[PDB]
A paper describes a structure:
Proliferation and transmission of these obligate endoparasites in their host organisms rely on efficient cell invasion. This active process is based on the motility of the parasite, referred to as gliding, and is empowered by an actin/myosin motor. Actin polymerization occurs between the plasma membrane (PM) and the inner membrane complex (IMC) whereas myosin A is part of the glideosome, which binds the essential light chains ELC and myosin light chain MLC1 (called myosin tail interacting protein, MTIP, in Plasmodium spp.). MLC1 (in P. falciparum: myosin A tail-interacting protein, MTIP) binds at the very C-terminus of MyoA, while ELC is expected to interact with the C-terminus of MyoA upstream of MLC115. We demonstrate that ELCs bind to a conserved binding site on MyoA to induce its α-helical secondary structure and stiffen the MyoA neck.
To investigate whether the homologous complexes from T. gondii and P. falciparum are structurally similar, we determined the crystal structure of the P. falciparum trimeric complex (PfMyoA, MTIP, PfELC) at 2.5 Å resolution. Overall, this structure resembles a similar fold and conformation compared to the T. gondii trimeric complexes, with the typical MyoA helix kink of 131° between the MTIP and PfELC binding sites. While the secondary structure elements are maintained, the position of the PfELC helices differ. This explains the lower binding affinity of trimeric complex formation in P. falciparum. Of note, the electron density of the PfELC C-terminal lobe is less well defined compared to the remaining structure, which is likely caused by increased flexibility of the C-terminal loop of PfELC. Contrary to T. gondii TgELCs, the homologous EF hand loop of PfELC (in isolation or in complex) is bent to the other side and does not possess the residues needed for coordination of calcium.
Numbering used by the authors:
A (entry chain A): 0 to 134
B (entry chain B): 65 to 204
C (entry chain C): 774 to 816
Write the structure that this text describes.
Amino acid sequence: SMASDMEEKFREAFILFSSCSDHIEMYKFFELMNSFGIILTNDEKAALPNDINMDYWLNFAKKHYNYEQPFKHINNVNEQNTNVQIKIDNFLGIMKALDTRLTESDLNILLQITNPENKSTLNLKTVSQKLTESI
Amino acid sequence: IQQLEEKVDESDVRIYFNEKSSGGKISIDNASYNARKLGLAPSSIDEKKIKELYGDNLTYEQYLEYLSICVHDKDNVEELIKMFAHFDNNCTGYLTKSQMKNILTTWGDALTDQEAIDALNAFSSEDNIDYKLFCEDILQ
Amino acid sequence: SVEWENCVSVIEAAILKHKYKQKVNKNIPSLLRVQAHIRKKMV
């Protein structure tokens, strides 16, 4: 099933973000779920256990993942700012402005998955499509 | 190749083929079984290389070629531990059985949970595994 | 904007996961040799 075929990628990602531990630190669990486009409300966060293991993650992921639009939250800004070809510079400006953990080198990896070589026009619907393709 | 003739028993090459051949040909799966019985260690890379050349079913000569690319002379403890070293977070040179099981079953030519837990129980009865020693044991 | 904060959270995290994945891929050739020798030991 869509769910069972994701379980491989969910297991891989828990191992990568926990550095192959049994239990994953909370700040790392937020990155882990965000990496598959999942965002909770503060009320859902309050119900999370502090001791998170692989099995919790796998049930959490199978329920909260959006099978049809994994990166909906990227295209939900399109309701705010409609599909526009942001300048490669203007898009870097939007990223470094909002507090971000991604370096210019990490920005190049983002450019390396999304542009790929056009180096001209980038709409948020390609970057969501490119990022789903590389799951 | 002079590296093959030196490492494997030449009579056991002929015989293992006869043990598994059919219509003058041996299946890649069987050639890999023979390679392991001879003390070689093919990967999926070695199976993909011979399949691109000859297909699923090997003549005796095609089978001798497959055994020559399965030699992998460069393999030592330094080259095997790279993935365990990556995930060793305490710099102790040990990983738990769960950690090794997850590493062996997630990536590459993944083992099944059983194949992995069997290989690890065969090496040690203790939860902490000296990954350098584990790689020494499977190499010899 | 919460919609913007959401959008960057998911992009940063998806790049992080890509970096972690491309660093374990560097180690897979090695891991195939571990798996190969295990399959040989246990034949």
